[PDB]
Amino acid sequence: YVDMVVNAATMMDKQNDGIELGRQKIGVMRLNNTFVGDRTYNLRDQKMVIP
C-alpha cells in the first residue's frame, strides 16, 4: 500500500505540470462620462496634453 500510494502520487504531480488553468478572459467596458482618447490643447506658447 505505501509503495503504491507514494509512486502514484509522485507521477500524478509530474503529469499535472502539463495542465494549464490560468486562462485569460476579455471584458469590454464602455465609458459614459468621458472621451477614451488622449487630448491636446495649445497654451500661450506651449502645448498641454491630457492622457
Partner 1 sequence: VIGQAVNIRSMETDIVSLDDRLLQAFSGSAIATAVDKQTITNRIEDPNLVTDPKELAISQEMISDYNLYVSMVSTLTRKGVGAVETLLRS
Partner 2 sequence: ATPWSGYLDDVSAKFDTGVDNLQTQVTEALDKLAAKPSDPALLAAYQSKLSEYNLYRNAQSNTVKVFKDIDAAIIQNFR
Query: 9: helix, coil or strand?
Result: helix
x-or-dash string of contact with partner 1, 9-48, rule CB under 8 A? xx--xx--x-------------------------------
Nearest to 39 by CA among 48, 50, 28: 50
Phi, psi of 11 (to 5 degrees): -70, -45
Q: Which residue number, 20 or 45, has a Cβ lying nearer to partner 2?
A: 45
| Binding positions for partner 2, rule: CB under 8 A | 6-7, 10-11, 14, 40, 42, 44-47, 49, 51
